[PDB]
């Protein structure tokens, strides 16, 4: 029940997602692994310990490596998973950049609104992709042969980002709804340094209209009443999570440098 332009819009986004999302993480390799001012630390202490994960690697031969992280003993132990996380983030960010670049609506913006929309939304698009491999019953992100298992209840969902992943997973969205959420978020007319506000705003309104129409054509069940409005509220939450994670990343980077070159680009760090 979508117009021809709407069906075209979904097809192009589904196509860009198919070409740039390595859902089995086959091409993520060469990554680092964990080895074998007072109020600043307390804040970074608080920052890192809210999402503790164990790590699993399944070998191509049938072997398994498992990593249980240290307990908080007040020292540098809390940074042991950071270089690995930054390699995963970088790998995810590359996929996200390729996603934007293959979308015609994105390619037709000026190069400096592109860079500035990407800086605004890279974390949000990455979290949206990670929700699709998140297993809410085991508390696990299943990334191919890599697994990231949350670490022992519902106090765990006090961390807003964990609560976001569980709430988003409960809506049981289709692939099309996920990519439309990525578009609406990528084309946010109000990111720092956007110049073509009006063009980006019309594109966004239009990805939103397609999503509302998609839901109305394909989900008549009483369970998905107001589903479109739940998605828009989740996007608002994610924008907020996104700003909190940016501050926390800069606080950590301030006392313990870890960001990759691509992360420095996306987050304003100049290397000087
Ligand atoms: O790409 S980055 O590195 C991956 C980590 C974070 C996202 O940023 C979180 Cl929040 C998510 Cl999502 C996953 Cl998956 C993990 Cl493992 C946790 Cl720590 Cl749960």
């Amino acid at each position: 029940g979508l117009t021809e332009e709407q069906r075209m819009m979904i097809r192009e986004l589904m196509d860009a997602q198919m070409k740039t999302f390595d859902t089995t993480f086959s091409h993520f390799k060469n990554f680092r692994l964990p080895g074998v001012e007072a109020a600043k630390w307390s804040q970074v202490r608080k920052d890192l310990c809210s999402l503790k994960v164990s790590l699993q690697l399944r070998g191509e031969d049938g072997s398994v490596w498992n990593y249980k992280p240290p307990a908080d003993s007040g020292g540098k132990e809390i940074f042991s998973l950071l270089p690995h996380m930054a390699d995963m983030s970088t790998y995810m960010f590359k996929g996200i950049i390729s996603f934007a670049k293959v979308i015609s609506y994105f390619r037709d913006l000026p190069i400096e609104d592109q860079i500035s929309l990407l800086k605004g939304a890279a974390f949000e698009l990455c979290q949206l992709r990670f929700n699709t491999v998140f297993n809410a019953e085991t508390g696990t992100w299943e990334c191919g042969r890599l697994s990231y298992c949350l670490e022992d209840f519902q106090q765990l969902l006090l961390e807003p980002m964990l609560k976001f992943h569980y709430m988003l997973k409960k809506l049981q969205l289709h692939e099309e709804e996920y990519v439309l959420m990525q578009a609406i978020s990528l084309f946010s007319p109000d990111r720092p340094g956007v110049l073509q506000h009006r063009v980006v705003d019309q594109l966004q309104e239009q990805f939103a209209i397609t999503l509302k129409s998609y839901i109305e054509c394909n989900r008549p069940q009483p369970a998905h009443r107001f589903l479109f409005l739940k998605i828009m509220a989740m996007l608002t939450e994610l924008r907020s999570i996104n700003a909190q994670h940016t501050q926390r990343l800069l606080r950590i980077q301030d006392i313990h440098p870890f960001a990759t070159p691509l992360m420095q680009e996306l987050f304003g760090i100049t290397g000087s």
Side-chain angles (χ1 to χ4, degrees), residues 206-222:
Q206 198 54 58
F207 288 121
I209 291 174
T210 292
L211 175 58
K212 185 178 196 290
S213 293
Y214 179 88
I215 286 161
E216 278 161 10
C217 300
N218 307 284
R219 295 180 168 272
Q221 297 69 248

Side-chain angles (χ1 to χ4, degrees), residues 10-23:
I10 291 179
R11 262 312 282 293
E12 204 201 352
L13 299 167
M14 283 307 278
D15 187 71
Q17 180 88 313
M18 176 266 295
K19 289 157 168 182
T20 66
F21 189 1
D22 182 20
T23 57

Side-chain angles (χ1 to χ4, degrees), residues 53 85 88-89 92 127 130 141 143 148 161-162 165:
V53 290
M85 298 301 161
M88 179 54 101
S89 294
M92 288 306 289
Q127 292 308 308
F130 269 120
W141 290 268
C143 304
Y148 302 90
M161 184 161 185
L162 293 165
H165 278 280

Side-chain angles (χ1 to χ4, degrees), residues 130-141:
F130 269 120
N131 197 77
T132 61
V133 304
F134 179 62
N135 187 324
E137 306 95 285
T138 71
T140 292
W141 290 268

Side-chain angles (χ1 to χ4, degrees), residues 104-151 155 157-158:
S104 55
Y105 312 88
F106 189 83
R107 246 196 293 110
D108 286 340
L109 296 160
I111 195 77
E112 62 281 8
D113 280 9
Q114 297 189 22
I115 286 150
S116 189
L117 285 191
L118 279 168
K119 290 177 166 196
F123 175 80
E124 291 169 31
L125 271 55
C126 286
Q127 292 308 308
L128 288 171
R129 282 183 165 186
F130 269 120
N131 197 77
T132 61
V133 304
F134 179 62
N135 187 324
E137 306 95 285
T138 71
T140 292
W141 290 268
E142 301 178 324
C143 304
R145 292 203 172 278
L146 223 41
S147 273
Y148 302 90
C149 182
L150 292 164
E151 182 89 285
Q155 63 180 111
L157 321 169
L158 298 187

